[PDB]
Every structure is written in C-alpha cells, then in structure tokens.
Amino acid sequence: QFSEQVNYQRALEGELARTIETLGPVKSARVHLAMPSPSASVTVTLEPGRALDEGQISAVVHLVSSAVAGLPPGNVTLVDQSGHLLTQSNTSGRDLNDAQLKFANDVESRIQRRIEAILSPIVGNGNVHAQVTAQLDFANKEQTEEHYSPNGDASKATLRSRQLNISEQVPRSTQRNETSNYEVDRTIRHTKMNVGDIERLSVAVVVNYKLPLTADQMKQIEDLTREAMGFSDKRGDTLNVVNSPFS
Amino acid sequence: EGQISAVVHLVSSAVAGLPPGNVTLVDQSGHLLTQSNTSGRDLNDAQLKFANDVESRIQRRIEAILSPIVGNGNVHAQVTAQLDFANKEQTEEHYSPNGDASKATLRSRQLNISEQVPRSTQRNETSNYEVDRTIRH
Amino acid sequence: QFSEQVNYQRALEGELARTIETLGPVKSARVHLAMPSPSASVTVTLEPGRALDEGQISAVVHLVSSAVAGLPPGNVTLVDQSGHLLTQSNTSGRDLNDAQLKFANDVESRIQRRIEAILSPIVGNGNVHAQVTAQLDFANKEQTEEHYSPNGDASKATLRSRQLNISEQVPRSTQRNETSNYEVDRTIRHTKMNVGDIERLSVAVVVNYKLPLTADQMKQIEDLTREAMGFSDKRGDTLNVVNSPFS
Amino acid sequence: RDLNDAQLKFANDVESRIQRRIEAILSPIVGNGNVHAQVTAQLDFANKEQTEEHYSPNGDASKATLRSRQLNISEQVPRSTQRNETSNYEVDRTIRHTKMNVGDIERLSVAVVVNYKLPLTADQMKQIEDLTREAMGFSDKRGDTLNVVNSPFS
Amino acid sequence: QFSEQVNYQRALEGELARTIETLGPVKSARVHLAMPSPSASVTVTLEPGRALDEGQISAVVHLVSSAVAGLPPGNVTLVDQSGHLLTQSNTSGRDLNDAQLKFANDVESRIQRRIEAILSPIVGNGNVHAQVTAQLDFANKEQTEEHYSPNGDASKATLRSRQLNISEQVPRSTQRNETSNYEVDRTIRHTKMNVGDIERLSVAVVVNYKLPLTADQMKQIEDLTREAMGFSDKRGDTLNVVNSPFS
C-alpha cells in the first residue's frame, strides 16, 4: 500500500519532468516531490547559451505547482545546471518586496511613457526626457464608519413609543413625565483600501532647445505634463520642467 | 498578438543571455507592445493592465472623434484615470420622521384623561407607532 | 483501489490532451491533473508561427475546467513551448472587471450605430461621426422599502379593539380613559436593482460640410440624436453636436 | 542572518533605482558621463499594526442621537422644582485598522557631483538641484537631504 | 514494513545525489537523510579547481530541503571534499553571534564603497580612503502603545449614557446628581522593531594632496560624505575627514 503511493509519485516526477523538457530553453529537467504540506525541486538544465527570463520562471513554477495536489507556488524550487537558485520561496525573508519595487517601477514607467508620448509630437522625437518618482503605499488598511443621523430636533425624529404623563393642579403643582424610544438612521460604510494606490508623485522633465523655447511655450508644455501626470495637489504632487540644451 | 513574439524572440535569441522578458517593443505611436508583468505582485499589475484599458479606450475615442476634423495624423491624446479599487460596502437604514401627528402611524394608544373642580387635571398617554423603514444595501 | 482512481486519471489526462491537439493552433498538448480543491496544467505546443489570442486562452481553459469535476477555471494553468505562462487567473483578481469594459463598450457601440444609422440618410453615408461615453453602474444595490399609512385621522383609522371608559360626576369631576389597537396599511416594496444600468451618457457628433449647414438644419439634427441617445435631463446626459469640414 | 541580510539586497535595490533615475535625468543636460550620484536610504523594516477607534463628540444636543430619553419634570409653587433626565445615546464610530508596510523609505540622502563644462552657472546649478529634488521624491517631512556640488573630474 | 520506508529512503538519497551531480561544479554528491524533525547531509565533491559561491550553496540546500518532506533549509549540511562545512545551520556556538559580525561588516562595506564611489571622481581614482564603524542593534524588541484621547472637555466628550437628576427647594436645599458613561477613542500601535538597524555611524575619510586642498574644496567633500553616509545627528553620528599626503 505504501509502495502504491510511491510507485505513483515516482511516475508523476517522471511525467512532470517530461513536459518541462518540451519547453524550449530547457534541455532536461529533473523534479522531486515532497508530498507528506508539499514541495518540489525542479533542476532544469537549460540549452547551451540560454537563460530563463523573469516570467519564464513562473512558467516552470506554475507548471509544477498546479500539476501537484496542494502545492503552492511558494514551495517550488527551480535550479539551473550552474547552481543559481532561480526561485525566491527558498529565500522567503520577504521575497515580496522585490515585487513592491518592480510594481512601483511599472506605475512610473507608464506615467513616463505617457509624458514622452504627449510631448514627442510638440518638441520632436527625442528632445524630451522625463523621470517619474511615485510613492506607493502598501499598508493593508481597513475601515468601518457608522453614522447616525442626529434626531435632536423633534420634527425630524422617528419615535417608536412615547409615554407622556402631564399632571397638574391649582399652588400650581405641575408635573410632566415623558419617556421615549427613538429609532435612528444608521449608515454603515465598510471600506477595505487598495494595496498599491499612488500617494505622491514627483515628475522631472527636461526639454531640448530649439535655441531657447518661448516662455509661454514652456507654460503650455508644463500644462500638458500636469495632465499626463494626473497632477493633484491634494496628494501633494510636484512637477518641475526645465528647458536646457542637450549633449 | 503572435506577431509580437516574432520580433521579441528575433532579438531575445540573437543576443547572448537575453530572456524574452527584457525585450521592449514600441511602435511609432508610443504603444508599448510588450509587457513587464511580475509573479509576486500578481494582483496589482492587473490593476494596471485594467487601468490601461480604461485609458486606452478614452484615448481611441478622442483620436477617433477628432481625426475626422483635423486629419488622421494631426492629433494625439493621453488619458490618466485615477481609478478606485477599494472593496467597499454600505448599509443605509433610513426612517421617516413621525413627529407630525397628521402623518404618524399609531399601533396602540392609551389616552387616560381626568379633571376635577382647583382645576386638578391630568393627562396620561402612551403610544406605539409603526415606522417607515428603507434599507439600502 | 488506489490504482483504480489513478489508472483513470492517467486516461483523462490522455483524453483531455487529445482534444486540445485537435484545436487548430495547438500541435501537441500535455495536461496533468491534481485531483485530491483540484488543478490542472496544460502545456500546449503551438504550431510553427502561431500564438493563442486573449479569447483563445479561455477556450483551452474552459475545455479543461469543465471536463474535470470541481475544477474552477482559476486553477487551470496554460503554458506554451516557450515558457510564457498564459493563464492570468493565478491572480483571480480582475477577470471580471475586464468584462465591465466589454459590456460598457457594447452599450456605447449600440447608441453609436443608432445615431449613425439615423443621421446617415440626412447628411450622407460617411458625412457623420459619433462617439458615446456611458458611465455605467455596477453596484450590486438592493433595497427594502416598507411604507405604512397615516392613521392619525379617525375618518380613516382601522380599529381592531377599543375600550372607552367615560366617567363624570357633576365640581365637574369628569374622567375619560381610552385604549385602542389599530390595524395598519403596510406596503413592502423590495427592489434588487440591476447591474449595468446607465447612469449618464455623453455623445459627441460631428457632421461634414456640404458649405456649412443651416441653423435649423442643425437644430433638428440635434433633436434627432437627442432621441437616438435616450436623452434625459434626469441623468444629466450631455450632447454636443458640431459642424465642421472633414478631410 | 539569512532573513536579515535580505534587507541589504532590498535597500540596495531602492538606492540603485533612485540612482539610475538621477543619472538618467541629468545625463541629457550635463552629458553622458559628467554626473555621478549616490543615494542613501534609511528604510523601516519594523512590523507595525495600528487600530484607531475614533468616536464623534455628541456633547451638543443639536448633533446627538438619542436612543431613549426619560425626562421627568416635577414642579411645585417655595418653588420645589425637579428634573430627572436619563438619556441613552447612539455614537458614531470609525474603526481604522492599518498594517504598515515593511520596507518603506524613512529618509533619503543624495549626493550629486557634476563635472565642469569651467564652472557651471549658478542658475544652471539651481535647475540641476531642482531636477534632482524631483527624481528623489524629496519630502521635507521625511527629513530628506540633497547635496549637489560642482567640481572638475579626473 | 520497516524495510519499506528504508528501501525507499535509500532510493531518495540515491536520486537526490544524482541531480546534485548534474549541477556543474559538483563532480559527485553523497547525501544521507535523517527522517524520523528531519535532516540531511550533502557531501559534494567539487570539480578540480572550483568552489561553490555564496549563492551556489543555497542552490544545493534548497535542492534538498524541498525534495524531502518537512525538511527546513536550516537542517541541511553541505560539506566539500576538503572538510569545509559550507552551511551555517550547524555551528552551535556563534552561528547567529558571528553572523552579527558578517552582517555588520556588510553595512560598513557598502557605506565604504559608496563614499569611495562618490569621491573618486573629484579627488581622483585612488586618492581617498574611508573606513566605517556601525554600532548596530540586535536587541529583539517589541512594543505596544495604547493611547486614549482625553475626554475631559465636554465639547469633545462622547457620552454613551447620561443620567442627570436635579432638585431644589426654596433654605435653598438644592441638589445635583449626574452619572455618565463615555466612549473613548483608543489607538493601539504594536511595533516589532527591526533586528539589525543602525544605532550610530562613525566614518573616517582621508584624502591625498594635489599641494594641499583648500577650505571649500575640503568643506564640500565633507558635505558629500555627510550625505553618502546618511549622517543624522539624531543618531549622534561622527564624521572626520582629514587631508594628508599619501605614501
């Protein structure tokens, strides 16, 4: 019975490694599974003069993470024929904050590829350079408001019961007991903020000379960038565009 | 979509040690054709792929509504969409004010009254209302 | 008994991969299942000089997600013969929000076709362009009104019981107790609003010259689109029609 | 420590990206190799949670929300008065719950050296200080510091 | 039954050692497992004239840590054909304690290279030297604040209930009872400080002559290093730059 679930695992490993071989850059793979939480360890041997890209690693990770029951992609270990541990699950100190940087690069590559594309028509193909700096927050935040419309003013309150005794005598010994049980409006917002929104932008743009561009023409080049940025001083953004000759 | 990998692998392979994830293809109209998706922050790049579409559409639209007027090459427009991805709920629970007796809705009432004569009066009164109640969610 | 549910899974994998082969761009597939939450990992090898489109991926995803019991399409992993993990589901984040753009495009494509089809006869086949932008609404809103009816008036109350004690001792030491137990009219609406209704429209229409167009001639062209839109000041829809020569 | 020298790799990626960005934005002006910048980042690798629980002041009755209210008001007239008054309230309550990010920049220090052309003009050097002030993300509330000097290379 | 889980372990060891052989610098490996917390002990025999780098060790560690069920990478032991225990999850005495010197040397290795990199342009390639001393901090520390906003002010208090009796009699026998229950906003931070931050830097910098250097030409070199350090008087840092001819 034990050699049943072992003669099978030895076949899975030999089948999983037959596909990773039929994958292009890989010349021969060699995978071992650790099914007891599980793990795997691929040992691809890339073709002569080749190297798996950053997105070609997840190809071989998910190719094994998914073909094995209950194996997350954080347990798969990929290694070349020259050492070079390619995965980062084994180096799970953080292994997520390279993503926090690669991501915040993509957010800034866009706002740069855009500013370079809204001014290339005006000032020519390569007479403008822009570098963006974005401060992205990654605080996993939540919230829960709970409002309550004020029923202070009687004419906008919503009574549910009301016991009102009004005694009186005449030595005018009056009396007035008055209970109440209001009902209350009640909003309940429950946000859950996004992990990675932009918190502040910083854009610096240089533009070649023509000879110096017009003072007005820079004020209009500024205004385009203020839009291609999504400039919002509420976020405390900041833009600086200077005009000076190039190399 | 498959003509991009033609030009990516045409360069990724002709250069020693260059994976296809590092090649960047760009047209004569901006339009970065390749991609730099990651595997760790796999959710948040979608928040960019998506937000790129939202802006790709408003851009085509403006390029398509004005190119008739000013010509098919004399206009460019870039859009920046500050999107929102905060999973958010709400539950209003409105009521209607029933202080004005003409529009209250009693369910019970116990209006004890009295008097003597030294006008030693009295007036007890209970009341139980029913209440309009909207519940948006 | 174990080699029963394993000799079978090995046949499913070999059958599932025989269909993905008979699929056009695919030259040879290779699928492994991970039935215990299950998973799969297709490894298609596209024909020389081919690439699966964005909607040709869901073809191969649902082709496997459905042929396996309890396997959602968020667990299927598709990989080419050149790495290139094609599946954008491992994220499972925004496979829905892409559909909110296809939909919002169709809604706007229809109002565009209609505005072209109504004005094409008047001003000519190609002498008009229109573009529509619709702020749709995808909030899964629900509601439960519950109205009552004001029985504060005796001439429209509905007593169910009534106990009215009226003493009097003429020093007119009168007295008057009274109870009541009304029945109440009680409406209960319960909406569950629709996901994708239009919140606001915005249409821009250009019309070629002939020579300009007459004031009234435009004033009525404006009124046509105002009906082809579905224009409603309640939603605050915006229409803007201009007349300018084409090129 | 294996988990703890992954903070020097991470802090060196943050610095090397700010450094590429400063050279990439000054290389057009001063020249391809007439500028060198070095950035020092103090990062925060402390885990940190938080949980506010704000309430809204209901001391003013024109903005309170009563749930109940038993107000007795006896009075005789020698003016023996009286005025009991219970009041149950409903209170507006926000509840944030942050879990701060591990690895945010706390403070930056950037040092830039630009070659000579022959010194650069005092105006041409302010517009280099200002460009660098945007490639850093210069925030004065973080206590960022920038130093650009002009001196001939070797 | 026992020779079942032993004839298997002897095969795992022989399979795991067949991959580490197909790994480049390794000529022949020899691994034993200790599955009962498990452990392993690889005994690679590198090729003639080779040595595994610092990141080539984790390649062979994770190659085994992952191929064995429940084996952390802190239990794998790698040894060459010349003694030389390569892993560091085996020293009992100073494994962590010596690491605080390896680590605190890197924090100083960088700031050293940095001050050379920034100053070598100005003063010349090899006309400067810098040595850095970093008083690090490895005290595992936690914290838990719990603040409360002061509600002594009625205008910014927040009653949850309040019972306010009053009286009088006129012999002005007055009276005033008053209960109160408040709600109190309550922040709760919970830090967990980083083990390995910097307490204080001390940097010494020597620069060659040219023929000494002037005041500003020295002062600005002081200002650069003050930035290339991360100088902040809050940490009580110390910088000393001197100009003296080399030899």
Reduced 3-state DSSP string for D64-126 = CCEEEEEECCCECCCCCEECCEEEEECCCECCCCCECCCCEEEEEEEEEEECCCCCCCHHHHH
- Rounded CA gap, C164 and C152, in Å? 18
Chain A: residue nearest E74 by CA? A90
- Chain B interface test: which of A168, A174, A233, A234 (most B C-beta within 10 Å): A168
Place of tokens 């994998």: C13
Q: List A residues 70-109 in contact with C (Cβ-Cβ < 8 A).
A: 70-71, 73
Span between the terminal Cα atoms of chain C, in Å: 76
- Rounded CA gap, B83 and B48, in Å? 10
- Rounded CA gap, C123 and C209, in Å? 9
**3 state SS of A42:** strand
- Rounded CA gap, B20 and E157, in Å? 63
CB–CB contact C43 A53 (8 Å):
no
Using an 8 Å Cβ cutoff, are B126 and B109 in contact?
A: yes
CB–CB contact E227 D154 (8 Å):
no
Name the region of C125 (left: φ>0; alpha: ψ -120 to 50; beta: rest).
alpha
- Rounded CA gap, A165 and A169, in Å? 14
Q: What are the backbone dihedrals phi and psi of residue A128, each rounded to the nearest 5 degrees, phi first?
A: -145, 140
Give A154-191 as a DSSP string.
Answer: GGG-EEEE--EEEE------B--EE--EEE------B-
E226: Cα within 13 Å, side-chain hemisphere: 15
- Rounded CA gap, D66 and A20, in Å? 69
Contacts of A100 in chain B (CB under 8 A): 41
- Rounded CA gap, E121 and E211, in Å? 19
Using a 10 angstrom Cβ sphere, with 0-12 exposed, 13-18 middle and 19 or more buried, the burial of residue A61 is buried
Contacts of E164 in chain D (CB under 8 A): 83-85, 87
Closest CA to E66 of A111, E58, E85, C240: E58
Give Cβ neighbours of residue C220 (< 8 Å, ≥ 6 apart). Answer: none
Using an 8 Å Cβ cutoff, are D31 and D124 in contact?
A: no
Contacts of D63 in chain E (CB under 8 A): none
**Closest in E96, E158, E166 to D58, CB measured:** E158
Closest CA to C203 of C110, C138, C126: C110
Query: E210-217: long-range contacts at Cβ-Cβ below 8 A with a sequence spacing of 24 or more?
Result: E212/E243, E213/E243, E217/D151
Q: List C residues 42-61 in contact with A (Cβ-Cβ < 8 A).
A: 43, 45
Contacts of C91 in chain B (CB under 8 A): 42-43, 46
The CA-atom distances, in angstroms, between A148 and each of A145, D58, D65, E180, E188 are 10, 11, 7, 20, 25
**DSSP designation for A213:** P
- Rounded CA gap, D107 and E112, in Å? 19
- Rounded CA gap, A34 and D86, in Å? 68
- Rounded CA gap, E78 and E84, in Å? 9
A89: tokens are 């699950």
Give chain E as a DSSP string.
Answer: -TTHHHHTHHHHHHHHHHHHHTTSSEEE---EE------EEE--EEPSS----SHHHHHHHHHHHSSSTT--TTSEEEB-SS--B--SSS-SSSHHHHHHHHHHHHHHHHHHHHHHHHHHHHH-TTSEEEEEEEEEE---------EE----SGGG--EEEEE--EE-------EE--EEEE---EE--EEE--TTEEEEEEEEEEE-------HHHHHHHHHHHHHHHT--GGGT-EEEEEE----
Burial B31-46 (b: 16+ CB within 10 A, else e): eeeeebbbbbbbbbbb
Helix (H) or strand (E) holding B53: helix B46-70
**By the CB < 8 Å criterion, does B124 face chain A?**
yes
Which partners does chain A have (≥3 C-beta pairs < 8 Å)? Answer: B, C, D, E
Chain C: residue nearest B13 by CA? C82
Q: Where are the beta strands (DSSP E) in A26-180?
A: 26-28, 32-33, 40-42, 45-46, 76-78, 128-136, 158-161, 164-167, 177-178
Contacts of A92 in chain E (CB under 8 A): none
Closest CA to A203 of A224, A220, A184: A224
Rg (CA), chain A: 33
**By the CB < 8 Å criterion, does B126 face chain A?**
yes
**Closest in A37, A41, A75 to E63, CB measured:** A41
Place of tokens 């009687």: A154
Residue D29: Cβ within 10 Å count: 22
**3 state SS of B127:** strand
Q: How many CB pairs under 8 A join A and B?
A: 174
Note the Cα C105 to chain centre separation in Å: 11
- Rounded CA gap, B11 and D23, in Å? 27
C78: Cα within 13 Å, side-chain hemisphere: 27
Q: Cα distance from A115 to chain B (closest Cα, Å)? A: 8
Q: What are the backbone dihedrals phi and psi of residue A22, each rounded to the nearest 5 degrees, phi first?
A: -85, 65
CB–CB contact A177 D17 (8 Å):
no
Closest CA to B35 of B43, B44, B26: B26
Q: What pairs with residue B89 in β-bridges?
A: A190
Q: What pairs with residue C128 in β-bridges?
A: C207
E235: tokens are 């940490």
**3 state SS of B134:** strand
CB–CB contact D93 E183 (8 Å):
yes
- Rounded CA gap, A108 and B36, in Å? 12
Q: Cα distance from A242 to chain B (closest Cα, Å)? A: 21
**Closest in B40, B80, B86 to A191, CB measured:** B86
**DSSP designation for C223:** H
**DSSP designation for C47:** P
Residue D122: Cβ within 10 Å count: 8
Which partners does chain D have (≥3 C-beta pairs < 8 Å)? Answer: A, E
**β-pairing, A40-42 with A32-33?**
antiparallel
Contacts of D107 in chain E (CB under 8 A): 230, 232
Q: What are the backbone dihedrals phi and psi of residue A63, each rounded to the nearest 5 degrees, phi first?
A: -60, -20
Name the region of A124 (left: φ>0; alpha: ψ -120 to 50; beta: rest).
left
**By the CB < 8 Å criterion, does E139 face chain D?**
no
Place of tokens 């850093």: D136
Place of tokens 């690090």: E136
B75: tokens are 């206009």
CB–CB contact E67 A39 (8 Å):
yes
CB–CB contact C206 B68 (8 Å):
yes
CB–CB contact D134 A133 (8 Å):
yes
- Rounded CA gap, C203 and C222, in Å? 11
- Rounded CA gap, B96 and A46, in Å? 73
Q: Cα distance from E58 to chain A (closest Cα, Å)? A: 7
Helix (H) or strand (E) holding A221: helix A215-229
Rg (CA), chain C: 34
Give Cβ neighbours of residue A157 (< 8 Å, ≥ 6 apart). Answer: A151, A182, B97, B99, D66
Give Cβ neighbours of residue B78 (< 8 Å, ≥ 6 apart). Answer: A114, A117, A118, A227, A228, B55, B59
Q: How many CB pairs under 8 A join A and D?
A: 172
- Rounded CA gap, E224 and E226, in Å? 5
The CA-atom distances, in angstroms, between E64 and each of D33, D37, E20, E38 are 47, 43, 9, 12
Q: Is the dihedral of CA C68, C70, C72, C77 positive or negative?
A: negative
Contacts of D127 in chain A (CB under 8 A): 242, 244
Contacts of C40 in chain A (CB under 8 A): 66-67
- Rounded CA gap, D82 and A92, in Å? 71
Q: What are the backbone dihedrals phi and psi of residue C7, each rounded to the nearest 5 degrees, phi first?
A: -60, -25
